[PDB]
Write a protein that binds this ligand. Sequence first.
Ligand code: RV1
Ligand code: RV1
Lengths: 167, 449
Amino acid sequence: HMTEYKLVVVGAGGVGKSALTIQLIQNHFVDEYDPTIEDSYRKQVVIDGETCLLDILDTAGQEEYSAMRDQYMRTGEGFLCVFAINNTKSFEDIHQYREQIKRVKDSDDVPMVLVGNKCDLAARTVESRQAQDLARSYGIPYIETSAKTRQGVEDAFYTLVREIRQH
Amino acid sequence: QMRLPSADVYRFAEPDSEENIIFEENMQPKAGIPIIKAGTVIKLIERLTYHMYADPNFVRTFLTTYRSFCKPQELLSLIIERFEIPELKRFRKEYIQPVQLRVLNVCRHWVEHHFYDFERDAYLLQRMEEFIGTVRGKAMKKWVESITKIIQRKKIAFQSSPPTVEWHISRPGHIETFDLLTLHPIEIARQLTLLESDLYRAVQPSELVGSVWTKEDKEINSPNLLKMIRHTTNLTLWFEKCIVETENLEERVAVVSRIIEILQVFQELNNFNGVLEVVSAMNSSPVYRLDHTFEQIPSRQKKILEEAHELSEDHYKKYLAKLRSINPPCVPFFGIYLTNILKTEEGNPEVLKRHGKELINFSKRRKVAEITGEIQQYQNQPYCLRVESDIKRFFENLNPMGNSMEKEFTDYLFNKSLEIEPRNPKPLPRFPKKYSYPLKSPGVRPSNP
Ligand SMILES: Nc1ccc(S(=O)(=O)NC(=O)C2CC2)cc1
Ligand SMILES: Nc1ccc(S(=O)(=O)NC(=O)C2CC2)cc1
C-alpha cells in the first residue's frame, strides 16, 4: 500500500493551533467541518511526485491533560510545534515541547517543524527573525501560516513529510 | 393563509426568504419538523416560539448555545417583543395564544436549565420577574405560576445494598498507613471511580460551549472541568511516582502489578477515565522504559495492560466503540469531547452569507449541543458503591508534585527512572527494600458475597 505518515501537532492551547490541521483537511473553498469522522484527520496527498497518506493527530483542547502527551508523542513519526505569532508565552512554551518529544523518542534528531501561526488581526509580538533563530538553534525548518487565508499551511505539512523522508 | 401585521410594527411578521432563513435537507427524526441551518436572530426567535408547532429540540439547543450570537439581556428583549403582538378571532387563537404560550415555555426552560444567566446578572432576573408580572390571562396563569415557583426554588439553592468495603493491610480508621499497596486494590478502584464519577457529573455545558475552558478566564468559567482534569493528571503522576520511587526491582514489579489490578477493576466498573489514567502512567517516559520491571510482570497482566492501551490507539476508535456498547453507570474520558467541541467551533464559521445578508450559523451550534447532550447522558446514573470517607479523603488530598513545578517534577521522575534502571550498557544496580509489609496482592476477586 502507499506510505502512511503519522504526524503530531503540539503547542499551547488558547491561541488557534487547531486551524492548521482544519485548514489542511478541508478544501480551500469548503468550510463545513465535522471532527467526529475519519476523513477529518486523514488526507491523501502527493508530495514531490510521491503519493502518500497523512494521519494527523491534533488533541487541541486537551492541554490540561499534561500527563497524556508521551503516549501521543511516541507513535508520531513527525511533529509540528505550533505557536501563535501574537502570543509570546506560546512561543516560549516550544522549548519544553521539543524537550518532551526528544525524551519520548530518545533522540536529538526527530523530524520536526516549527510553525508560527497568524491566528487573528491582533498585533504581532513574535518577529519572524526570533522564530528563524530558534528554529536554526534546533536544526529544524520554520514556516509561518495564516489561519484566515490558508497561506503556508500546505508548506508546513509538506516540509515535515520531507523531513521524515530524509530522516 | 392568515393576515399578519406589517414588519414596521412587528418584525416577526416579515416572511421567510433565502436572505433571512435556511434549512437542512432532512427533518427532525422523531418530529417531522424542518431542521434550521441558519437565520437572522429575529427569524431564530420566531421559530423558537413558532405558532404552527412546538419545537423542543430547537428550544433546548438554542438555550444551551445562544450566548455566542445573542446576549441574555438581548434575548429577553426579543422574547418580550415577540409576546407583545399588535380574521381577528382566528388570529387571537391561532397566532397570539400559541406564540405567547411558546414564549412562556422558553422563559420556563431558561430559568429551569440555564439559571446561571440570572445568577450572573441580577438585572436579567429583575426584568424576567417584571415581564412575568405583566402577563394576564387564564390560559397563561398556570404557566406564570410555574415560572415564579421555579425562580424561588432556584433563588434558595436509590438502589439495593452496595457491596462490602474491601480491606487489605490497612484496617478501617488507620489513615496514617494508607498507601497504594496497603489499601485493597478493589477499594482503590471503587473509591477513585466514585470521586471521578462525581467530578464528571459536576461538569455543566456552560463550561464547554464557546470553548471557554481554553480561554484566559477558564478558571472562572470551567472550574469543575478543570478540577476533573487536574484529579486525573494527579492520579497519573501519583502512579508514575509510586513506580519510580520503588527502587528495589521486586517491590517495583509488585507496584506495577497492583496498578494493573486497579485497572482491571476500572475496566469492570466502566471507569474509562481511570483506565486511561493507568495507561497514561504506563506509557509515560519514566515508566515506559522500565524493561527489567515489565519483563517480570505476569503475561495475564501484560495482556490486560496491552488491551487497555489499544483503546487509545487510532484516534480512540476502540474506546469509542466500547463506550457506545455499554450502558451506565460509567465514567467517560472527557478529552475527546473537548477536542470535538473546540474543532467544531473553530472549523465552522459563526455566520453564513446569503444574497449579501449575514445569517447566524445555527448548525454549528446544534453540533456543539449534540456533544454536550452526549456528555449529559452519562451524568444521570450513579454507581451502586458505598463511599469510604477516609479512602475518599486520601485520594482527594493526593499531591505527588508537592511544591514542585511540572518540569522540575517530571525531570525528577525521569532522573529516578534512569537511576533505578540505567540506560544500556550500564548494568542494573540493586537497591534496598522500602516496604516492611508483605507485597502479595489480595487479588481483585471480591473477598465477600
Ligand atoms: N498521527 C497519529 C499519531 C499518534 C497516534 S496514536 O495511535 O499513538 N494515539 C492516538 O491516536 C491517540 C488519540 C488517541 C495515531 C495517529
Ligand atoms: N473484579 C471486580 C469486579 C467488580 C467489582 S464491583 O465492586 O463492581 N462489584 C462487586 O464487588 C460485587 C461482588 C459484589 C469488584 C471487583
